[PDB]
Design a protein around this nucleic acid. Structure first.
Ligand SMILES: [Mg+2]
Ligand SMILES: [Zn+2]
Ligand SMILES: [Zn+2]
Lengths: 119, 729, 122, 147, 56, 105
RNA sequence: AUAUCA
């Protein structure tokens, strides 16, 4: 989604349709502000989420002693130095796929041999 | 070769030192001492001074005279134990005479009192010793007890047994042991899913209470209305003294954070995270009605209370509730809206984080989130209600004696028997409360010390009671802190915990030296936080009070750790760094159960990651063992060993054996048990000895590693009923 | 080290003790969102009054009003540094910092009526 | 099972499918609300092909677009046709439904109604996920086959 | 336990007691057996009154 | 003057806002007003803009330690300084052109 | 009232 606020109010924006020119706007319900929409998408639900998997990957991730290490060669820098964890999306369903974070290039690679990622 | 790695037998030389110093009841004594040396004074100074003002009728002489009288409480004194015989004479009293003549082993409580007088005519206030207040029972072997600085031969002449360990009181001649009471730690943010049939799907709770001073047990609930699949999922919060749950938005507005997005900035810290933000749109719609700070306070003020009809009245209320009853930890002061707003926002962040299935529901049974109220705090709780009982009986007197000008006689004013018999009652009977009119009061807090066998006495001074999710089960967090076998069979099974040998309980220190230290070490104060400017900022807490943020925690954490390992920051203080969650929580807090572990450092010029303690320290200790200059404190200040509570345990990585779990591989005995490996290169700490996970009773079980789990649980119950010499006296 | 470079250093008059407003130098802070422009023909006038104490700021009628509230303190403190024509600096401690703290407005003939409608809701 | 078809595993599956409860929620990846003002031409270039057909061989400019999971649509055996049919038969002539073919890469259902419409569609998507029953009998979840 | 790395689903991590009683238990094996052992003592304790009232 | 009025920021006078450590301010108080309370001097170094604060020798007996300053942004905010005199007149003295923090040394 | 016993 990614929504905007009113400059002047800082209050949130409500969508208004410009019936005449068939176009979407964003009105402020505290002042007389109006701005045209960036995207046609107003609301996104998302039931089968993937946002949470690689959360809290601070560059300090290597400083956690609790995290386990592996000798897996990186897809980028080919470094056999990396820390690993499972999908941080705390759901029942969730697969046991592993996320490896490079102790040099910091690139996040997975063990998923069914699908190919970029997060 | 004084810097050679330590063997497995050497861990006993450290354990020897731990016990040479601490003894078996350090928890019981260290608690009481803290209460006598510090806690006692602060209880006399919280409410302390009381005033009575007599303003005239302003008719004519003898009217038109306005006065104000003061009564102040200064330093508090406490004698060695004494006794007031029938024939007036007061003299010292030793533990043996107490037990035989059924007396109480108590000492005198004395407080400096001052009585000022002031006066005005028809605005300008112009001015016109040490009193006994009660007898406080002493815990044996404490600082105040005669037996504390007593040598072996000394005790024998005193007809006491040197093997006796102290840790009890003597009330009317019977020994009494305060049992540690287990409660959930306060000022703690916890998110819980509210069950299938409920309007509210998840709740963020905070049991806010003061470290000392009245202790407002006001628990704030931040409720997520609507269930997983219901439209209009709003967030409302139940505020103390307010009947209804106010939509979060109005609270922020009443706080001063007026526009949406300024409000949203306090809740969601990532401008990217659309998922959490969509979840806030309903709240914004809910709070759309109220647009300024005033109208927000009226809306809060409307919803009583009772209602308290009058416009000026309701808006004035909401001010007071937000100041005095809403989030009372942090501050109860005035201009701290910014601090309490960011906290509420941190709570909503956690509420939504769990509902978005990114975090797990809080484990209500994590030992790190539990506190143990020992002899110290128990007496502190009782003394508070007992001193406010005395304070308000003196006031009742100051009225009675200003009416008839009967000369404010001190002895008539202060009733000694109030605090004396008020404590004697609790300790005797065991109903921890005021007084002969007790219920609900908690019975069994104080009980008669088991003297069947010596082990029976020891295990009674390490007993824990838990009153009222799955409490009886042995939790992982109980490792090294509580005995896995020593628990009763039936009704109390798993609700009566027994402390492991090396377990100690945090006495409670001062947070300010750490808050002062933090700010000076790169900690940006919350009052000036701008979430989107510093978005990766590690949020720093000291006793569930969010103080600010820090940009390079890596270096700060190392400084704080070096501060502790030096002694500059007390060793009983807990500090944890959850990298993934971007948080640094600090605990100066009383009641936390801790255990000592060996420190391991990657730091070794020659080779790998190795245990700080070397064969040279070990001989340095056994030199002092032969002398009966290198104590347990010596290992602690030399940062070789450290104290780790359950919350801190979460972030460490421990090796069981040092030698067996340190150098890697460059035939094997079949009779020995199958063991794992030292695969970890990450090891932060090492286990002094794994047998230390056991309590007093289980520690007499030979080969408990060769018995079926409950057979061990049985022995740690029977040995308490086994005959033998209990004391040499 | 040696200074091959030049530094311009100005004498700082640690706060003069005796000043007419030695006692009060305060900070009035506005959030950028408020978009207050001091150079406004309209904002030529301005009145600052204690509300009986938050400060109340108001322009001529028809213009926005702001409320000023005091921020919490800390160990460090702020000083205002001003420079004289001669380079010397004079520093003055900030007495208080206020976050302002104004109006909107469009809050008349409403609020109480909207809540009532909301109640006609439950 | 019925006397005859007692050893027939395929008959067991048929009943399993006919009884085990299935909701539009269990098949949906995500639902989206878009402003697509021309009913005949789409702002989403993906969907461009779905229109080109479900038109050849008046309504709201607000679009409810939901993506279904192929893997999920299979375990609880279902077709885009049959899923769409349920929605169509639920909202009758007050909702205009189109759907991407079972063959087509992404699985999509485009819906439109027949001033003020934003909240209206958010109600329609809740009805859709929570109240629309595809297969099965109510109260009957997790149906296992057993020998 | 704090002696293990995170996301360890190994038998040794989730409570598999590899050894015989004759051989002896490792501290980890000992504590896990203790957790499992405590569970039975809890039901023995509870069942006792629940079972009693059913009888009545 | 005009009662309840605010004074003159229109002149666009600029001032700097500096955060100082409590200990330093404590030292500054020591300086005598009669002296004019000259606490020390501010150094502006080039080759990059570096600003530091050094205490006067009189203030302490040792080698004066420079306190580095971290320059900071105005932030999305407008900061103005207003003064209230004993007379209680209120004046809008200046706008904060630059913000800085004096680090402890 | 706590502790305990099978
Ligand atoms: Mg029997
Ligand atoms: Zn606006
Ligand atoms: Zn790499």
């Amino acid at each position: 989604t990614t929504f905007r606020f009113c400059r002047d109010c800082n209050n949130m924006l409500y969508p208004r349709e410009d019936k005449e020119n068939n176009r979407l706007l964003f009105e402020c319900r505290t002042c007389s502000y109006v701005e045209e929409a960036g995207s046609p998408l107003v609301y996104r639900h998302e039931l089968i989420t993937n946002i949470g998997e690689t959360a809290g990957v601070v560059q300090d991730i290597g400083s956690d002693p609790t995290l386990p290490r592996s000798d897996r060669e990186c897809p980028k820098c080919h470094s056999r130095e990396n820390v690993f964890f499972q999908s941080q999306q705390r759901r029942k369903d969730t697969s046991m796929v592993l996320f490896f974070v490079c102790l040099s290039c910091s690139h996040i690679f997975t063990s998923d041999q069914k699908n190919k990622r970029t997060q | 070769d004084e810097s050679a790695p330590i063997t497995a037998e050497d861990s006993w030389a450290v354990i020897s030192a731990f016990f040479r110093e601490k003894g078996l009841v350090s928890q019981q004594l260290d608690s009481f001492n803290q209460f006598v040396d510090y806690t006692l004074q602060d209880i006399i100074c919280e409410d302390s001074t009381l005033i009575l003002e007599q303003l005239a009728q302003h008719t004519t002489e003898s009217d038109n005279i306005s006065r104000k009288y003061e009564i102040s409480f200064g330093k508090i004194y406490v004698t060695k134990p004494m006794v007031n015989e029938s024939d007036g004479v007061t003299h010292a009293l030793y533990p043996q005479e107490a037990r035989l003549r059924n007396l109480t082993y108590s000492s005198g409580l004395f407080v400096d009192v001052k009585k000022r007088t002031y006066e005005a005519i028809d605005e300008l206030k112009y001015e016109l010793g040490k009193v006994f207040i009660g007898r406080l029972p002493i815990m044996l072997r404490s600082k105040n007890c005669y037996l504390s600085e007593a040598t072996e031969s000394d005790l024998y002449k005193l007809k006491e047994c040197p093997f006796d360990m102290g840790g009890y009181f003597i009330i009317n001649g019977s020994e009494k042991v305060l049992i540690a009471q287990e409660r959930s730690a306060g000022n703690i943010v916890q998110v819980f899913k509210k069950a299938a049939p409920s309007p509210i799907s998840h709740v963020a709770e905070i049991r806010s209470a003061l470290e000392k001073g009245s202790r407002f047990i006001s628990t704030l609930q931040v409720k997520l209305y609507g269930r997983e699949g219901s439209s209009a999922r709003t967030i409302k919060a139940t505020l103390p003294y307010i009947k209804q749950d106010i939509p979060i938005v109005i609270i922020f507005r009443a706080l001063g954070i007026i526009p949406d997005g300024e409000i949203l900035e306090h809740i969601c810290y990532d401008v990217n995270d659309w998922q959490m933000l969509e979840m806030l749109k309903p709240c914004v719609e809910d709070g759309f009605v109220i647009q300024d700070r005033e109208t927000a306070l009226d809306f809060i003020g409307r919803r009583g209370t009772a209602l308290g009809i009058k416009k000026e009245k309701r808006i004035q209320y909401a001010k007071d509730i937000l100041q005095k009853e809403f989030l009372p930890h942090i501050t109860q002061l005035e201009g701290f809206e910014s601090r309490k707003a960011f906290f509420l926002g941190y709570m909503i962040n956690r509420l939504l984080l769990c509902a978005l299935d990114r975090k797990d529901q809080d484990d209500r049974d994590h030992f790190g989130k539990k506190r143990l109220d020992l002899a110290g705090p128990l007496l502190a709780q009782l003394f508070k209600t007992l001193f406010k009982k005395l304070t308000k009986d003196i006031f009742r007197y100051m009225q009675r004696t200003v009416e008839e000008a009967h000369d404010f006689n001190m002895k008539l004013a202060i009733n000694a028997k109030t605090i004396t018999s008020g404590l004697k009652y609790a300790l005797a009977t065991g109903n921890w409360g005021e007084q002969k009119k007790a219920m609900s009061s908690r019975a069994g807090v104080s009980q008669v010390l088991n003297r069947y066998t010596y082990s029976s006495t020891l295990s009674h001074l390490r007993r824990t009671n838990t009153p009222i999710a799955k409490p009886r089960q042995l939790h992982n967090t109980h490792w090294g802190l509580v005995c896995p076998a020593e628990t009763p069979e039936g009704q109390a099974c798993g609700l009566v915990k027994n402390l492991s040998l090396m377990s100690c309980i945090s006495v409670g220190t001062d947070p300010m030296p750490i808050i002062t230290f933090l700010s000076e070490w790169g900690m940006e104060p919350l009052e000036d936080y701008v979430p989107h400017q510093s978005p990766d900022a590690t949020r720093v807490f000291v006793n569930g009070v969010w103080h600010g943020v820090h940009r390079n925690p890596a270096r700060l954490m190392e400084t704080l750790r070096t501060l502790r390992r030096k002694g500059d920051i007390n060793p009983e203080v807990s500090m944890i760094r959850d990298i993934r969650e971007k948080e640094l929580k600090i605990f100066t807090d009383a009641g936390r159960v801790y255990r000592p572990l060996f420190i391991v450092e990657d730091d070794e010029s020659l080779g790998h990651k190795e245990l700080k303690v070397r064969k040279g320290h070990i001989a340095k200790l056994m030199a002092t063992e032969y002398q009966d200059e290198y104590t347990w404190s010596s290992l602690l200040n030399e940062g070789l060993v450290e104290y780790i509570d359950a919350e801190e345990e979460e972030s460490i990585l421990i090796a069981m054996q040092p030698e067996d779990l340190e150098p890697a591989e460059a035939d094997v005995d079949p009779a020995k048990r199958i063991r794992v490996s030292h695969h970890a290169t990450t090891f932060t700490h090492c286990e002094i000895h794994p047998s230390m996970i056991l309590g007093v009773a289980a520690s007499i079980i030979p080969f408990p590693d060769h018995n079926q789990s409950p057979r061990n649980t049985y022995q740690s119950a029977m040995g308490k009923q086994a005959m033998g010499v209990f004391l040499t006296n | 080290d040696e200074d091959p470079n030049e530094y311009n250093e100005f004498p700082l008059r640690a706060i003069p003790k005796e000043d007419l407003e030695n006692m009060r130098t305060h900070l009035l802070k506005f959030q950028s969102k408020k978009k207050i422009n001091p150079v406004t023909d309209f904002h030529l006038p301005v009145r600052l009054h204690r509300k009986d104490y938050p400060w109340v700021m108001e322009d001529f009628d028809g213009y926005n009003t702001w409320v000023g509230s005091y921020e919490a303190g800390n160990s460090d403190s702020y000083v205002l540094l001003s420079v004289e024509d001669d380079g010397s600096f004079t520093m003055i401690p900030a007495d208080k910092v206020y976050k302002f703290t104004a109006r909107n407005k469009y809050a008349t003939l409403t609020i109480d009526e909207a809540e009532k409608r909301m109640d006609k809701k439950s | 099972l019925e006397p005859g078809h007692a050893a027939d595993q395929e008959q067991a599956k048929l009943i399993r499918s006919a009884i085990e409860h299935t909701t539009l929620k269990s098949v949906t990846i995500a639902s989206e609300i878009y402003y697509d003002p021309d009913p005949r031409s789409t702002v989403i270039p993906e969907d461009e092909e779905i229109i080109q057909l479900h038109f050849s061989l008046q309504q709201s400019p607000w679009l409810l677009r939901l993506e279904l999971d192929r893997a999920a649509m299979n375990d609880k055996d279902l077709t885009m046709g049959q899923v769409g049919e349920r929605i169509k038969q639920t909202f009758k002539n007050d909702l205009f439904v189109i759907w991407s073919e079972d063959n087509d890469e992404k699985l999509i259902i485009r819906c439109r109604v027949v001033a003020e419409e934003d909240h209206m569609l958010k109600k329609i998507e809740n009805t859709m996920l929570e109240n629309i029953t595809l297969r099965g009998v109510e109260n009957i979840e997790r149906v296992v086959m057993m020998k | 336990l704090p002696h293990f790395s995170k996301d360890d689903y190994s038998p040794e991590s989730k409570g598999f007691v590899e050894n015989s009683y004759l051989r002896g238990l490792t501290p980890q094996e000992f504590f896990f057996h203790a957790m499992g052992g405590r569970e039975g003592l809890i039901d023995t304790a509870v069942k006792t009154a629940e079972t009693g009232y059913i009888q009545r | 003057e005009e009662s309840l009025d605010l004074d003159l920021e229109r002149s666009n006078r600029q001032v700097w806002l500096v955060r100082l450590p409590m200990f330093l301010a404590e030292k500054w108080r020591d300086r005598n007003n009669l002296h004019g309370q000259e606490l020390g001097k501010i150094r502006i170094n080039k080759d990059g803009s570096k600003i530091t604060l050094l205490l006067n020798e009189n203030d302490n007996d040792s080698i004066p330690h420079e306190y580095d300053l971290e320059l900071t942004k105005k932030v999305v905010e407008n900061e103005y300084v207003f003064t209230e005199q004993n007379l209680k007149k209120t004046a809008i003295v200046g706008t904060v052109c630059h913000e800085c923090q004096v680090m402890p040394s």
